[PDB]
């Protein structure tokens, strides 16, 4: 509850409260509130802003639910203390409810809930296997007159001509070999090991991490399922 | 040839360029190939028509007889430098099978369609444009008639493209010798329908050997740029 994040507020000291928070039709957003300003009212009438990325003709603000008063806590990373601490959607306005045009952590629960509803069972578990690309340099840029894209990492194949200063060293992962190969060859385990700490830290359960297969710096971190609504936001 | 080469080498440099009869010197592409076509004749009659496959003639293949019985020592001849053999990979498209056929190429000896019987030859494709054409013209004749000679037959044409069931005995076909050590050895023992008339001296054949050895060797014990690609970071 509130009553409590409440405390954690001071637990912690934070001021500031933010990183994520809504999330468009595509991913990802936040807005900083000043410390105080939260307190209950903040918890259950919520605060509000409008439109941009969905939305048409003038005015529609939407309440920001500040909540699942629960996804919250302190980001590691901005500055000063803050309980980065989502919220659900915008609710809608008065009614309250499925924001503007969207509303997709909403969606996901009228989805779940309404699951529930049916019988067909109780719970949905979802446990996704999200991979990603660690470079080092990535340019790219488009207009009139060409085109273009560059992408660059001390692993990638390419990157053995290459000369460096230190240089070379040769150690890294050839096309399709990236293949949990141990380290010289590694780009490096310090940066999954690390963003486990900090996943967990943030509060997932991560199950083991490694190098997927791409030459340059394909990285797989695994986490233990949930429901969608929270893996969703997990 | 000799002329041939002086002219290419020299307008080529004449123009800006430098000009190489290398088999070989890029990979994936197409290195050049000096296919000879041939036959002999008696008066004004080449006894190389008749009827019996394609035109051609009893006499003519006793000629693909002697080639393909020597096709190894002969590619010592009319195969050097090591890079020669870069070529002569199996392909599908190369012609590294000892068979003819006027198609199915992968065959290395193709009796080009004909019409005037006036012209009907053997094309055998495998030679390449770093041969004196002396040694690898006689080599090539000198077998060609000890075919001609004692008896020696091809059998049948191949139209059937190399491809079955790899081993299959496809696998048990004949090979055109790919790769020059093997090469060298033939000659070591064929030597025979060289020596044959006088056209060839143990010397020469030694000698000859003797000198192809050495590059093999530089060759094989210098460590190339692709081993460190594959052989490295062990
Ligand atoms: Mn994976
Ligand atoms: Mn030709």
Same mark, same amino acid.
């Given at each position: 509850? &509130? ?31 000043? &410390?105080?300003?939260? #307190? ?118 390419? #990157? ?58 394909? #990285? ?5 399922? #949930? ?8 | ?234």
């Amino acid at each position: 509850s &509130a009553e409590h994040v409440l405390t954690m507020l001071n637990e912690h000291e934070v001021k500031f409260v933010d990183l994520r928070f809504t999330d468009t039709k595509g991913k990802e957003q936040h807005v900083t509130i000043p &410390a105080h300003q939260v #307190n209950a009212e903040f918890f259950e009438e919520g605060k509000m802003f409008d439109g941009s990325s969905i939305g048409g003709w003038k005015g529609i603000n939407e309440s920001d639910m500040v909540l699942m008063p629960d996804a919250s806590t302190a980001v590691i990373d901005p500055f000063f203390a803050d309980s980065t601490l989502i919220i659900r959607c915008d609710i809608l306005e008065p009614g309250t409810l499925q924001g503007y045009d969207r509303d997709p952590r909403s969606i996901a629960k009228r989805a779940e809930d309404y699951l529930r509803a049916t019988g067909i069972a109780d719970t949905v578990l979802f446990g996704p296997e999200p991979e990603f690309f660690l470079f080092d340099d990535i340019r790219f840029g488009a207009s009139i007159s060409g085109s273009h894209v560059a992408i660059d990492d001390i692993e990638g194949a390419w #990157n053995s001509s290459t000369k460096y200063e230190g240089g070379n060293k040769g150690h890294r992962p050839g096309v399709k070999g990236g293949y949990f190969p141990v380290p010289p060859v590694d780009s490096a385990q310090d940066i999954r090991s690390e963003m486990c700490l900090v996943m967990e830290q943030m509060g997932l359960v991560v199950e083991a991490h490694h190098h997927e297969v791409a030459t340059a710096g394909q #990285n797989e971190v695994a986490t233990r399922f #949930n429901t969608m609504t929270k893996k969703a936001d997990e | 040839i000799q002329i041939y080469k002086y002219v290419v080498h020299n307008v080529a440099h004449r123009f800006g360029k430098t000009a190489t009869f290398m088999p070989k010197p890029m990979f994936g592409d197409n290195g050049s190939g000096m296919h000879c076509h041939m036959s002999l004749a008696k008066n004004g009659t080449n006894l190389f028509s008749g009827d019996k496959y394609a035109g051609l003639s009893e006499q003519a293949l006793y000629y693909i007889g002697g080639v393909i019985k020597h096709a190894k020592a002969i590619n010592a001849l009319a195969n050097p430098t090591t890079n020669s053999y870069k070529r002569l990979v199996p392909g599908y498209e190369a012609p590294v099978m000892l068979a003819y056929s006027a198609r199915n190429r992968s065959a290395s000896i193709r009796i080009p369609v004909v019409a005037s019987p006036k012209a009907r030859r053997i094309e055998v494709r495998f030679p390449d444009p770093a041969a004196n054409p002396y040694l690898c013209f006689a080599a090539l004749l000198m077998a060609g008639l000890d075919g001609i000679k004692n008896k020696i037959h091809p059998g049948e044409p191949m139209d059937k493209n190399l491809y079955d069931l790899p081993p299959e005995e496809a696998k048990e076909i004949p090979q055109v010798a790919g790769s020059l050590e093997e090469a060298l050895n033939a000659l070591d023992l064929d030597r025979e329908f060289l020596k044959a008339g006088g056209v060839f001296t143990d010397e020469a054949i030694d000698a000859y050997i003797a000198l192809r050895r050495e590059e093999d060797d530089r060759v094989r014990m210098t460590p190339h740029p692709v081993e460190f690609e594959l052989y490295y970071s062990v």
